[PDB]
Amino acid sequence: GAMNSSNYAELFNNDIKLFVDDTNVYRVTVHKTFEGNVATKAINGCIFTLNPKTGHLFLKIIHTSVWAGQKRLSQLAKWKTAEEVSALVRSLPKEEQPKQIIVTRKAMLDPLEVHMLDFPNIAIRPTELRLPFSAAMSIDKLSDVVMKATEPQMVLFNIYDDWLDRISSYTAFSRLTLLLRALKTNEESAKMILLSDPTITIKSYHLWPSFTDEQWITIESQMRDLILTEYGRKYNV
Amino acid sequence: MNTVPFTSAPIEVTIGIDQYSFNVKENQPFHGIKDIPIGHVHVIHFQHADNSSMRYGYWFDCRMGNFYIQYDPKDGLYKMMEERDGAKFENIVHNFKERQMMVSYPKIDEDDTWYNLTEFVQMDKIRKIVRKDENQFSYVDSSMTTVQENELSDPAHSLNYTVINFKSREAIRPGHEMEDFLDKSYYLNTVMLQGIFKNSSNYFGELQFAFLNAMFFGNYGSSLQWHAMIELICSSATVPKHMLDKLDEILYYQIKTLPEQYSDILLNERVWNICLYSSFQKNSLHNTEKIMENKYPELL
Ligand SMILES: NCCNC(=O)CC1CCCCC1
Numbered sequence: 001g002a003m004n005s006s007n008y009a010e011l012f013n014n015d016i017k018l019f020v021d022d023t024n025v026y027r028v029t030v031h032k033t034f035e036g037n038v039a040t041k042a043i044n045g046c047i048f049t050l051n052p053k054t055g056h057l058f059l060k061i062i063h064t065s066v067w068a069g070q071k072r073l074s075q076l077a078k079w080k081t082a083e084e085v086s087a088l089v090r091s092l093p094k095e096e097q098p099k100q101i102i103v104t105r106k107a108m109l110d111p112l113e114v115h116m117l118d119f120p121n122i123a124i125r126p127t128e129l130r131l132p133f134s135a136a137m138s139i140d141k142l143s144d145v146v147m148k149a150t151e152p153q154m155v156l157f158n159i160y161d162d163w164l165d166r167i168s169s170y171t172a173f174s175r176l177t178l179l180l181r182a183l184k185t186n187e188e189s190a191k192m193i194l195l196s197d198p199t200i201t202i203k204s205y206h207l208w209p210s211f212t213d214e215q216w217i218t219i220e221s222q223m224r225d226l227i228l229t230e231y232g233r234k235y236n237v
Numbered sequence: 238m239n240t241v242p243f244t245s246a247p248i249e250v251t252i253g254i255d256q257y258s259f260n261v262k263e264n265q266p267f268h269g270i271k272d273i274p275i276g277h278v279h280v281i282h283f284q285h286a287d288n289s290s291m292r293y294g295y296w297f298d299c300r301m302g303n304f305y306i307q308y309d310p311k312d313g314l315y316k317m318m319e320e321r322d323g324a325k326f327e328n329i330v331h332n333f334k335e336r337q338m339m340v341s342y343p344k345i346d347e348d349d350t351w352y353n354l355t356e357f358v359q360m361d362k363i364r365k366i367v368r369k370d371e372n373q374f375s376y377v378d379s380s381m382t383t384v385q386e387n388e389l390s391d392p393a394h395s396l397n398y399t400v401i402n403f404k405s406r407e408a409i410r411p412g413h414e415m416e417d418f419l420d421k422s423y424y425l426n427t428v429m430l431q432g433i434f435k436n437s438s439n440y441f442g443e444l445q446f447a448f449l450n451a452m453f454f455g456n457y458g459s460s461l462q463w464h465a466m467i468e469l470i471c472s473s474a475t476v477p478k479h480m481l482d483k484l485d486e487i488l489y490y491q492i493k494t495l496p497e498q499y500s501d502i503l504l505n506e507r508v509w510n511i512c513l514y515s516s517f518q519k520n521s522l523h524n525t526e527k528i529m530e531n532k533y534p535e536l537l
Pocket residue numbers: 023026027028029030074
């Protein structure tokens with residue numbers, strides 16, 4: 001059934017599973033028309049499909065051409081996502097296919113279920129966690145590959161860089177969700193925190209800076225402070 | 238006009254004949270029902286005064302044989318049986334009618350309620366949903382489960398309604414996932430009507446039979462089937478115009494006949510609100526929407 005704080009360690013067991021987030025699949029810029037009406041212009045989007053145990057990210061880039069001539073785009077985005085996730089599963093060798101797919105939004109359940117009818121043994125699950133994966137486009141290297149795409153494209157990343165050499169996947173996921181929650185609550189401040197010190201660099205093959213274990217504790221503390229501050233600045237506390 | 242005689246009434250029971258109901262006292266001199274409308278299927282049904290558990294009854298068509306009721310004290314129920322000796326049967330019934338031991342089926346209501354509820358219902362199709370091939374009549378009760386219920390346990394006592402499942406490979410063409418899920422016309426017209434039922438009359442027959450089993454026996458699987466068959470039509474953008482007009486008439490009589498105090502358990506709020514106000518056919522069921530809004534505005 002639904003995934004929540006009670007069964008939270010299930011994410012890091014040895015059953016292959018994927019999170020699917022579809023918030024940035026259909027994105028637009030808004031512009032007033034010459035007549036003074038409002039018009040949207042679609043921009044490139046992405047499906048965020050993540051193995052939380054290994055860090056493997058299947059980033060399917062959604063090029064704006066897929067919306068050309070189509071109606072009801074938010075509803076089509078749900079079925080396009082499900083079509084691309086099903087296509088990804090079919091492309092994986094049998095022993096790499098997931099046993100469970102957890103969707104971040106309840107509106108993806110029926111489209112994914114219908115697209116995965118051929119896979120009756122793969123469970124499609126909601127979650128009650130409010131995961132911050134929408135902020136994936138605040139990661140510079142991910143945003144860059146999405147906006148530069150001229151055609152549909154899949155790009156594979158490890159969203160944990162090399163952290164799993166030194167920490168467990170439970171700890172790596174907790175670090176990732178802390179970073180993404182901060183980028184979602186105040187992107188400018190979170191990015192200042194991550195890059196303030198110019199001696200700490202991002203390897204060419206990485207997404208995040210090359211922090212020592214000690215610097216990660218400082219960083220994580222600065223992110224917690226940011227989130228708590230904003231939550232004060234927000235509710236006045 | 239035909240007759241279903243009773244050997245006796247040894248236990249106190251409410252007997253219903255179609256939409257009608259009457260009470261028989263324990264060992265009351267009762268020998269059956271006469272003046273039954275030839276040309277319709279009929280249902281004779283029972284609720285014991287002692288144990289309201291298990292409503293049960295029999296679907297029959299008097300053109301197919303001479304049927305009577307006899308209480309069985311071992312199995313504890315009123316059983317339908319066929320009499321093969323036609324001269325014996327006639328003689329028993331004439332002697333019974335002469336003594337006024339039988340109650341009389343009403344003349345015909347102005348609304349033609351039974352005809353309208355059973356327009357498409359045929360005994361031969363009932364007997365394929367209810368498989369007991371040695372009898373010409375079909376037993377149904379409140380507890381019998383459907384084939385679809387049994388896939389999610391005694392096969393001989395099941396209701397073999399046509400399985401309808403909107404998230405199934407039968408319902409969804411590979412490559413038309415979004416199309417077929419949001420517009421069920423393929424599944425209605427090609428799979429079910431052309432493929433399985435052959436025509437809309439057989440579809441409506443099963444829909445009407447499911448409703449009547451839900452209403453008369455409180456059979457939950459039958460209620461599920463009735464609503465599924467409604468929802469499949471309303472959720473199709475492309476439906477023959479004659480079918481929509483006939484569906485509106487079918488449902489109007491069903492809603493008109495449903496006891497007001499059974500609406501909570503026999504009507505599915507989600508299906509009816511979707512069908513009347515959100516579906517492709519939201520504007521095609523004028524008579525049904527009007528009686529629903531006057532009789533059950535609460536559900537909506
Ligand atoms: N996901 C459907 C489209 N919604 C957005 O892409 C969000 C933008 C952000 C502010 C400008 C207008 C809406």
